[PDB]
Amino acid sequence: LELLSDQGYRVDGRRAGELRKIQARMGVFAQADGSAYIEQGNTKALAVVYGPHEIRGSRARALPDRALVNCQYSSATFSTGERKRRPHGDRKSCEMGLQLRQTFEAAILTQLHPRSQIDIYVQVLQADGGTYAACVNAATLAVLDAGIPMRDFVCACSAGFVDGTALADLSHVEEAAGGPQLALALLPASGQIALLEMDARLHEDHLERVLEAAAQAARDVHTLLDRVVRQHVREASILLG
């Protein structure tokens, strides 16, 4: 086992600056107002967005100014090789919920749907590294499929640091090694970050590198996603007339 061969290659067979082929789709479930699917390698996220609809049991939380974003996270038991139970209610899925919520409340441009729930839901079927970013991106595609206004593709990805270099879009192996991994989600058009999570020890001068690397990886993810979205829109319009 190893992470960076002296030549520059990884285990999976890709250099540091590149990533794995995302293969996506938009329109999985029709009984909803917006759905998506994404596989950013072996990972397999699945998003759903029940649109801006009425609040029931008002319970005096229907914001009158803006809309009410309610995003729920879930990591299936059979996601990891080690089976686990209680995927919801845990102290980690709820943190992921907070994160997704504060991202999309930033992006989703709620000032136009006051007193209304935008219900986002995310289920992770398979996890092999980069488990948050796949979900961010799937929920983005979902939102778009639901014609919900939103400032920009909020594209996310992860970076890491090994042997004085920066890796893009980590997997589980180098994610388990314990090295610093920095996940983020930004809005490309403006160059602004909507989220910045990070967990491990490393020096400071080695920050700009992984930071810009994650940013560029997110730009690439943006390219791929937007090509998908354009194919989808084109096909739909053609079928309309």
């Binding site: 409340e105 999570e197 491990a200 400071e204």
Partner: protein, 287 residues
């Protein structure tokens, strides 16, 4: 109960005083409040109060069967509770979002940064290992927690001492604080968080925000650091759009701030040891 609403008067006044770079109590933007570190009688208790925010920290030990994946190194159990005396809204089982984010952040910061030696505290590899839990309790809520919680956990885990143990084969012998002198822990580096607050989408940034400043802010950047300039965690919350240079500058700030806080902590422990070496069950340090 419920928190009293915020008047538009205070909000506008605060935003303007920020525009003009004026805090309320009279300090600058790149300044904390006078943080006091007070100790208890029992090794492992610390009350740290920054300005009005008091937080308590206790550290306890146990011996237990470890978990199979790691049968060599021990365990560590964080928990932070928001006592109803901190503020009215802190009813039990209601303000769960804040609990969750704080606890995950603190776990991450301390555990995954490898601040202590989970290996040194092994006794019988497979049968019995230590288990160090740390309970932080929020007493008064005026502004910045994460910093207080972290300073408390650190002062504790550096001011705690285990009941010594002898071992031969499987024969394990525990002893009392009166029969031998308890042994301290093994720290490698003391991280302590640093909290920045963003105003007007990213234009202005403050340090050690009070409660009102937390109510009229849109974004929060937490940054964990050491005296050796080693990022341990950084987190953005509040749904805010920042940039690169902002985090770079905030880091160059956290450097100095953490250096100074660390100097203080070390002085506090020194003074506490001196006191107990002279008769007295307390220890006090002031910023």
């Amino acid at each position: 109960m419920k928190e009293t609403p915020l008047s538009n008067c205070e909000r506008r006044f605060l935003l303007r005083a920020i525009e003009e770079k004026k805090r309320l109590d009279g300090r600058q933007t790149y300044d904390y409040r006078n943080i006091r570190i007070s100790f208890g009688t029992d090794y492992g208790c610390c009350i740290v109060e920054l300005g009005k925010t008091r937080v308590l920290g206790q550290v306890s030990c146990e011996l237990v069967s470890p978990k199979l994946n790691r049968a060599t190194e021990g365990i560590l159990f964080f928990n932070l509770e928001l006592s109803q005396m901190a503020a009215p809204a802190f009813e039990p089982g209601r303000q769960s979002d804040l609990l969750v984010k704080l606890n995950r952040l603190m776990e991450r910061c301390l555990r995954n940064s490898k601040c202590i030696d989970t290996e040194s505290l092994c006794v019988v590899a497979g049968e019995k290992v230590w288990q160090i839990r740390v309970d932080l309790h929020l007493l008064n809520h005026d502004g910045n927690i994460i910093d207080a919680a972290s300073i408390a956990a650190i002062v504790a885990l550096c001011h705690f001492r285990r009941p010594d143990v002898s071992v031969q084969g499987d024969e394990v012998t525990l002893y009392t604080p009166e029969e031998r002198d308890p042994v301290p822990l093994s720290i490698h580096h003391m991280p302590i968080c640093v909290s920045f607050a963003f105003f007007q989408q990213g234009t202005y940034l403050l340090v050690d925000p009070n409660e009102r400043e937390e109510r009229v802010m849109d974004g929060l950047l937490v940054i964990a650091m050491n005296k050796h300039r080693e990022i341990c965690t950084i987190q953005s919350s509040g749904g805010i759009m920042l940039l690169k240079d902002q985090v770079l500058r905030c880091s160059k700030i956290a450097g100095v701030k953490v250096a100074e806080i660390t100097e203080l902590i070390l002085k506090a422990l020194e003074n506490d040891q001196k006191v107990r070496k002279e008769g007295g069950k307390f220890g006090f340090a002031e910023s």
